[PDB]
Amino acid sequence: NLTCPACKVLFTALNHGLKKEPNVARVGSVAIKICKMLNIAPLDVCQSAVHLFEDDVVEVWTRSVLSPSEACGLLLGSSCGHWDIFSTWNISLPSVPKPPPKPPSPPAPGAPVSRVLFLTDLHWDHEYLEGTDPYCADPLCCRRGSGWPPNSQKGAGFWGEYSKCDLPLRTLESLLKGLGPAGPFEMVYWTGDIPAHDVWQQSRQDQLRALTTITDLVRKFLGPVPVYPAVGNHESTPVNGFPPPFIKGNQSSQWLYEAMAKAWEPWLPADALHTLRIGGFYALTPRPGLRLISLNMNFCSRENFWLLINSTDPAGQLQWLVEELQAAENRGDKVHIIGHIPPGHCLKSWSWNYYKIIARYENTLAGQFFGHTHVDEFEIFYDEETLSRPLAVAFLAPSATTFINLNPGYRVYQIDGNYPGSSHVVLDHETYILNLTQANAAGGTPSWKRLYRARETYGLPDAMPASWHNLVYRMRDDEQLFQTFWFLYHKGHPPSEPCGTPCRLATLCAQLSARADSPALCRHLMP
Ligand SMILES: *[C@@H]1O[C@H](CO)[C@@H](O[C@@H]2O[C@H](CO)[C@@H](O[C@@H]3O[C@H](CO)[C@@H](O)[C@H](O)[C@@H]3O)[C@H](O)[C@H]2NC(C)=O)[C@H](O)[C@H]1NC(C)=O
Ligand SMILES: *[C@@H]1O[C@H](CO[C@@H]2O[C@@H](C)[C@@H](O)[C@@H](O)[C@@H]2O)[C@@H](O[C@@H]2O[C@H](CO)[C@@H](O)[C@H](O)[C@H]2NC(C)=O)[C@H](O)[C@H]1NC(C)=O
Ligand SMILES: CCCCCCCCCCCCCCCCCCP(=O)(O)O
Ligand SMILES: [Cl-]
Ligand SMILES: [Cl-]
Ligand SMILES: [Zn+2]
Ligand SMILES: [Zn+2]
Prior knowledge:
- This protein is of the alpha/beta class and 527 residues long.
- It has one domain: Metallo-dependent phosphatases (Purple Acid Phosphatase, chain A, domain 2, 4-Layer Sandwich), CATH 3.60.21.
- It contains 15 helices and twelve strands.
- The protein has helices at 3-17, 21-37, 43-63, 68-76, 169-177, 204-222, 254-264, 270-279, 317-331, 348-360, 436-439, 454-458, 465-477, 479-489, 501-512, and strands at residues 113-119, 187-190, 227-229, 282-284, 290-295, 334-339, 365-370, 377-382, 390-396, 409-416, 426-434, 448-453.
- α9 links the parallel β5 (290-295) and β6.
- The longest helix is centred in the first third of the chain and has 21 residues, at 43-63.
- It is globular, with a radius of gyration of 24 Å.
- Bound molecules: a molecule of 3 linked components (NAG-NAG-BMA), a molecule of 3 linked components (NAG-NAG-FUC), octadecylphosphonic acid, chloride ion (CL) (2 copies) and zinc ion (2 copies).
- One chloride ion (CL) binds at residues 128-130, 168.
- Keywords: Disulfide bond, Glycoprotein, Glycosidase, Hydrolase, Lipid droplet, Lipid metabolism, Lysosome, Metal-binding, Phosphoprotein, Secreted, Signal, Zinc.
- Zn(2+) 2 binds at residues 193, 233, 340, 372.
- Zn(2+) 1 binds at residues 121, 123, 193, 374.
- Residues 1-84 form the Saposin B-type domain.
- It is found in: Lysosome; Lipid droplet; Secreted.
């Protein structure tokens, strides 16, 4: 009734009053008070952190949740406004009828094989310090500010520590030198997450220092080998905050996207840098017959608060994705996709609109590779209508960082080699680790070793989805087999707590949940 305008007026005033930071500072003070009461982190971390966020978090709030149109529609109904914050949305596919489903034929004898190294979640802590308390109250330890191990306890290890601690640069430098046996590689995929988890005290200069430093360190050791990286979530500041392109000004993400451009011009062509400076994604031809696609999965992130304003296909990334897939289908080209956050962890509507595009172009896809989870995992795609036929699989390589309680490690994919008629699909992959227990030991030397090989330990005929599909339900029945998977799940450093059946099924359910908030995919695991 007459309350409808009063709503629109009040929200307008508060939004204006939030232009003035002193009130925002008060509003910020409250968020801190909550931070301590909820024990997200020690108070030292709260104050620093909140001060970073309040400015931008309040901006989106004024532009979205507390916008008069949106808010009034919620309290009073459609009569007075419209509430659409995380409303659902759809993507339109082309008018081309999908060709009959078709799987790749296995490679012929003597066919060349390509090696592709996969690096993700390096997470460099430039403040990392040996001897400091690994058990500190702060969300990140083993550094300056962590203090020192109380009561004659062992401090942070020299190369790293099995705890909430990221890596020292020397351990990262060590990784690059020990790729001899893992190589030679034809190209590399790098799905971001370079900074550490010390978000409560990260200036843009701190962020870009890691970008440049780490980028130069890679290009140096790799040399002529092209590296194709993707955007991670820890790479901007504030973390997870990735304003879509329609946002402009100093609060835009231009500083980051343009900084990446300079650092990566040697690796990428012109048309890819064009789109990268805009939305943090790109595509290009790495070799004849293949088309690589790097996605800015921060436009699917629940954490991206900028999506409150408009969560509907930010940057038109999905529509841009379809353009490329259809083009490759016309050419007959295959496709690999890399991104940081895997689709199973995206926003619901985003994830579903993605699932369907996979289903449509199952024949075009030759690979999907992701990270962010820091553990060794995968996710299988099925036909949309029935979720019965597996049609694609994504690989969730484990992180390089120890964060948390992990052995460092990276991933290497053996794929169909560079030759005409290549399917460009994965044939096998290998995982290498660093056994810190032995490296940080007295008189110990860093030694990278192959933890295992895929088809070897799991005895698979191929790396196609069906093989993995069978693999999942197999482990549901056999206990000892999962205990092995559990071991490799943690890069050779599993937890102490045994994984009970509920832990097991939870883990296994995730392997099928390539789509968010859909219990039907875990129907077969428990009746
Ligand atoms: C990384 O290196 C560490 C080195 O400590 C490995 O942990 C060690 O693994 C050995 C055998 O795998 C185990 O030690 C056992 O000790 C018993 C008696 O305590 C002895 O009878 C056995 O012959 C064996 O030596 C134990 O799990 C562990 N040792 C210690 C001192 O912690 C770890 O397995 C390595 N990780 C990888 C992925 O290779
Ligand atoms: C919310 O956003 C979607 C698309 O994201 C952005 O929205 C536009 C405002 C613009 O910034 C685009 O460049 C971005 O992609 C909007 O839906 C799209 O709207 C455009 C028209 O601008 C249209 O061409 C597309 O077909 C639409 N696609 C979809 C999936 O909706 C939507 O209108 C935005 N809502 C508001 C209130 O701005
Ligand atoms: C009545 C509706 C119930 C739910 C409302 C919840 C919103 C709370 C957010 C308040 C943030 C504090 C900012 C105060 C800014 C004051 C500006 C006054 P001025 O423009 O005259 O200077
Ligand atoms: Cl140190
Ligand atoms: Cl079928
Ligand atoms: Zn990470
Ligand atoms: Zn991440």
